[PDB]
């Protein structure tokens, strides 16, 4: 008894594929399965996998056709006695692994070779024998290992040469299904939703009226009559073969004598909404053709003159208690377990329990507020409600990313979480992993079971989100905890204490915005209804949908160019680079293009293009999909941002409104300090320190971009969303929406010109719907991008071309400056802000009065220091002597505290 | 191919020739001064060699 690690993979067809992932369903050998060694007849069971380092039959006797295989190969399907060569029809004369498969009479044979150990090797087809026999047993002919094939889906990987170089079993692990669902081998960290789940039924329940009798169903035919309280044995609304499983009430038979000349007059065109069964029979071995007006259905002169019947059965159902129906062995009642229903006329599935609903005596069924059957009356007069189909929901897999581990936890969304545990170990769940264990269960507050994660008591910053307040993470086996909102802090409030900063720092932070998206086009008549005319004529009937679709996509494309134009083309003149790149003590390189390099992009703007990944020639595909080019090249968009930075460096604020006015860039930074409420002396006395902080902040940005993981996250999301929408549209062309084939020229080549028009219509309607869905969702996406481009144009005017007082609009501090940089399908702002720090404590008063005259500070607050009172600004400590020019007087000090002999 | 188009065939008489290229198709657009200045126009055949 050994294990088959990854053995038994073969090419499923004879079609060449290269560099792709292909999902298929067929009989395969599950990974890490049980393989029975041999160091003896063996059952077949719909296929086997055979190795070694054959005779096929049904009874291994003379009464059952058998087969024998054997570089001279002899395949002879004859009743060889186990001297017998009779009763046979087929003859054929011309680490090793073999696969055997019996289907539709043919017996397929695959074979491989390699000079059970570990590894995987791929087999190829050899024979396909139309034996057409029944194979259940076999025996070897003389260290051979036997597997078994089961219906499973695999994901097979091809390479450039078209060789199967890997596979995945999509029913082995939760991770294996996750890989199979997203169609990849490496998976990022996160939580993904996958196939649903549902508890499988547990039993069969039947309840029929206990009345038993022999029915006159036969007497009436050979001789309007009613039949009731019998058991018949045995079409316009029912199938004859399906009549012996439904229970009716008072089946009626209409009988009369008419020759075959009038049988073709009894049918609708008999009510129009009613059903029934009609029989007729002739043997030859009155009527009215005059009446004023016709008759309503089911209501009641010459002679036919017979010379040498029609029974219209009517069925009434689900109205009164069931009394007429065929043989059905009853069953006992089971409650509180997902079972099957076969009540009088209600076949379903669910959970039963006693009810508390006051049925009226003349009622037998129940209904909800939405017309669902949430109650029933047992044929033995009992009210039991069949609430819900036991259980179902969704399944989500939590993974750290497959780059750090292969351990995952599984969440079941909406379950009491005790039913799941019972079904897992009872083998009662449709998602059936071959290798999966349960060690511990946590019940999320409202998100259901969590299996594979251990609860911890501490709290962290919610790596992966789950449920309501409960998140999960790997480093913190994976652990599930409760969210932590932040750091608890306290402040001692008082009435005569204030805090004033005594130092600051320069901070530069980045901001990423998308402004545009891909500009695609379609060829309506080529995507649908390809290079053909029989189909092209059929598509003219659907009005002019193609013209509508082309107009909508042309509107989106022309809008993307307005987006980029509105954000960047905000300068009237193209200022040349100052060819100095050192102002005051500020280093402006790495944001201005280098003149000694080929590409005219700044250093920081070159790292942004190496972060986002997308994966004349003039290539074209068969599907009619294409992407148009932008109007502004990447070298023109980069010339706009270099002009904007050059204008800010020299001439500062006043470019745009008016004409650019020079300024040495050290005088304006002083002016930018007055905006945030700090005097000029602060800059001019600490210019060297401030310049150092500026240069360091830029360097950290450059280093971070080089060695980060995801800062251009929003720009990548736009690329992924557009590629996912096109891939869905392309893969919808390999789908047959009801026709026998999904490719034209395969039904257009085998046609009758009467039957091929119905399948072509099936594809046309299916492909038109998929096109409309693509256009609708692109219109919604394009409106969301327009919102982000409108905001980016506001930030260019208010953060780059000026100074902003709106709180936290540009940056996070006080917004000295801001520089733009170009990114693929986006823009990056670098906000330079001012951050005070190093608080101190002081004593303060509202006002000061000298000689009965109060003195309020014209601008600032009063402080005490430790020796004498002073007046200072709020954002920086710079005490000043209290004089008559800092203060002003208003009234007498009767409600304002404090006094000192320091004024004037 | 992915969309169940052949895109490549084997010559019965010992060769393999690419069916991929579906020759040329696209959309045409007309550039006009506006039937007022003049009546001469230019045509753009999009995505062709
Ligand atoms: C192979 O059979 C043995 C014996 O029952 C069993 O313990 C083992 O789990 C089987 N292999 C696998 C992969 O399940
Ligand atoms: C099989 O052989 C027997 C004689 O052993 C013969 O009677 C019978 O017809 C054969 N079955 C056929 C021909 O289907
Ligand atoms: C394809 O096969 C050739 C020779 O058999 C080999 O040189 C080449 O590397 C293979 N393809 C790849 C992608 O390696
Ligand atoms: C019933 O009989 C009356 C007698 O005049 C007749 O007018 C009427 O049409 C009949 N019913 C129907 C449905 O025609
Ligand atoms: C508020 O501050 C005043 C000093 O101006 C002090 O006298 C008073 O006690 C304070 N209120 C308190 C401590 O509740
Ligand atoms: C302000 O902080 C810088 C470093 O961030 C330091 O070098 C400087 O001495 C500080 N100034 C004061 C007045 O504390
Ligand atoms: C500006 O920084 C670069 C490196 O980022 C350095 O090579 C250059 O010398 C600095 N500026 C000046 C004027 O040196
Ligand atoms: C156009 O066709 C010529 C002829 O072979 C070829 O050399 C050229 O590369 C083609 N151009 C494009 C854009 O396909
Ligand atoms: C300022 O005083 C408050 C309370 O008086 C105290 O909580 C805080 O730590 C002090 N901070 C400094 C920088 O002195
Ligand atoms: C502020 O207080 C400090 C410490 O008490 C003192 O050294 C300094 O001289 C004071 N400032 C004045 C008196 O202007």
Swiss-Prot record, chain B:
Phenotype upon changing residue 24 to A: In strain: Isolate Tor2 and Isolate Shanghai QXC1
Glycosylated residues, chain numbering: 36, 49
Domain of life the protein comes from: Viruses
Function: Attaches the virion to the cell membrane by interacting with host receptor, initiating the infection. Binding to human ACE2 and CLEC4M/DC-SIGNR receptors and internalization of the virus into the endosomes of the host cell induces conformational changes in the S glycoprotein. Proteolysis by cathepsin CTSL may unmask the fusion peptide of S2 and activate membrane fusion within endosomes.
Protein name: Spike protein S1
Gene name for this UniProt entry: S
Residues of the full protein shown: 554 to 602 of 1255
């Amino acid at each position: 008894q050994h294990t088959s690690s990854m053995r038994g993979v073969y090419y499923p067809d004879e079609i060449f594929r290269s560099d792709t992932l292909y999902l298929t369903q067929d009989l395969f050998l599950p990974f890490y399965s049980n393989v029975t060694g041999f160091h003896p007849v063996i059952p077949f069971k719909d296929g086997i996998y055979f190795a070694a380092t054959w005779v096929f039959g049904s009874t291994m006797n003379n009464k059952s056709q058998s087969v024998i295989i054997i570089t001279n190969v002899v395949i002879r399907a004859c009743n060889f006695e186990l001297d017998n060569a009779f009763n046979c029809t087929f003859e054929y004369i011309s680490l090793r692994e073999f696969v055997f498969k019996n289907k539709d009479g043919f017996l397929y044979v695959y074979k491989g070779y390699q000079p059970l150990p570990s590894g995987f090797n791929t087999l190829k087809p050899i024979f396909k024998l139309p034996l057409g026999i029944n194979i259940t047993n076999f025996r070897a002919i003389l260290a051979y290992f036997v597997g078994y094939l089961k219906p499973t889906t695999f994901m097979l990987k091809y390479d450039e040469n078209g060789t199967i170089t890997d596979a995945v079993d999509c029913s082995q692990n939760p991770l294996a299904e996750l890989k199979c669902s997203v169609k990849s081998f490496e998976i990022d960290k996160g939580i993904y939703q996958t196939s649903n789940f549902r508890v499988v039924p547990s039993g069969d329940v039947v309840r029929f009226p206990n009345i038993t009798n022999l029915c006159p169903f036969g007497e009436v035919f050979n001789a309007r009559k009613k039949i009731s309280n019998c058991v018949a044995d045995y079409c316009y609304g029912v199938s004859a073969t399906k009549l012996n499983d439904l229970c009716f009430s008072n089946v009626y038979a209409d009988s009369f004598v008419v020759k075959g000349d009038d049988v073709r007059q009894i049918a609708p065109g008999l009510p129009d909404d009613f059903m029934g069964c009609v029989l007729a029979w002739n043997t030859r071995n009155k009527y009215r053709y005059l009446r004023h007006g016709k008759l309503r259905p089911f209501e009641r002169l010459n002679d036919y003159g017979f010379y040498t019947r029609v029974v219209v059965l009517s069925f009434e159902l689900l109205n009164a208690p069931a009394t007429v129906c065929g043989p059905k062995l009853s069953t006992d009642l089971i409650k509180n377990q997902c079972v099957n229903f076969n009540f009088n006329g209600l076949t379903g599935t669910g959970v039963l329990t006693p009810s508390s609903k006051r049925f009226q005596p003349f009622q037998q069924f129940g209904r909800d507020v939405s017309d669902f059957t949430d109650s029933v009356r047992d044929p033995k007069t009992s009210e039991i409600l069949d609430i819900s189909p036991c259980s179902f929901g969704g399944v989500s897999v939590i993974t750290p990313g497959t780059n750090a581990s292969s351990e995952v936890a599984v969440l079941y969304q909406d379950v009491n979480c005790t039913d799941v545990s019972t079904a897992i170990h009872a083998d009662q769940l449709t998602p059936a992993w071959r290798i999966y264990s349960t060690g511990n269960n946590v019940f999320q507050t409202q998100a259901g079971c969590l299996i594979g994660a251990e609860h911890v008591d501490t709290s962290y910053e919610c790596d992966i989100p789950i449920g309501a307040g409960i998140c999960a993470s790997y480093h913190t086996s994976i652990v599930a905890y409760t969210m932590s909102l932040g750091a608890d802090s306290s402040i001692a409030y008082s009435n005569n204490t204030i805090a004033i900063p005594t130092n600051f720092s320069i901070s530069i932070t980045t901001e990423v915005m998308p402004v545009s998206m891909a500009k695609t086009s379609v060829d309506c008549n080529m995507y649908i209804c390809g290079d053909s005319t029989e189909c092209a004529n059929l598509l003219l009937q659907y009005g002019s949908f193609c013209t509508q679709l082309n107009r909508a996509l042309s509107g989106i494309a022309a809008e993307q160019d307005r987006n980029t134009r509105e954000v960047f083309a905000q300068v009237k003149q193209m200022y040349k680079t100052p060819t100095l790149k050192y102002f005051g003590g500020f280093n402006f390189s790495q944001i201005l293009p280098d003149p000694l390099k080929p590409t005219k992009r700044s250093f920081i703007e070159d790292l942004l293009f190496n972060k986002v990944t997308l994966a004349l020639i003039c290539a074209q595909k068969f599907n009619g999909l294409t992407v148009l080019p932008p109007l502004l090249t990447d070298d023109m968009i980069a010339a706009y941002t270099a002009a904007l930075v050059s204008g800010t460096a020299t001439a500062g604020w006043t470019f745009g409104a008016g004409a650019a006015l020079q300024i040495p860039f050290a005088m304006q930074m002083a002016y930018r300090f007055n905006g945030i409420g700090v005097t000029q002396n602060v800059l001019y006395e600490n210019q060297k320190q401030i310049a150092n902080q500026f240069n360091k902040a830029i360097s950290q940005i450059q280093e971070s971009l080089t060695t980060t993981s995801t800062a251009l996250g929003k720009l990548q999301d736009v690329v992924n969303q557009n590629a996912q929408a096109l891939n869905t549209l392309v893969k919808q062309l390999s789908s047959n929406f009801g026709a026998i084939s999904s490719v034209l020229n395969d039904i257009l080549s085998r046609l009758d010109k009467v039957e091929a028009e119905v399948q072509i219509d099936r594809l046309i309607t299916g492909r038109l719907q998929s096109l409309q869905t693509y256009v609708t969702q692109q219109l919604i996406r394009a409106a969301e991008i327009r919102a982000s481009a409108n905001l980016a144009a506001t930030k260019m005017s208010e953060c780059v071309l000026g100074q902003s007082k709106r709180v936290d609009f540009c940056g996070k501090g006080y917004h000295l400056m801001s520089f733009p940089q170009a990114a693929p399908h986006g823009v990056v702002f670098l906000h330079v802000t001012y951050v005070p720090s190093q608080e101190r404590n002081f004593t303060t008063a509202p006002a000061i009065c000298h000689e009965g005259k109060a003195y309020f500070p014209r601008e600032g607050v009063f402080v005490f220091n430790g020796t004498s009172w002073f007046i200072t600004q709020r954002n920086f400590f710079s005490p000043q002597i209290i004089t008559t020019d800092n203060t002003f007087v208003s009234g007498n000090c009767d409600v304002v505290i404090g006094i000192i002999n320091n004024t004037v």
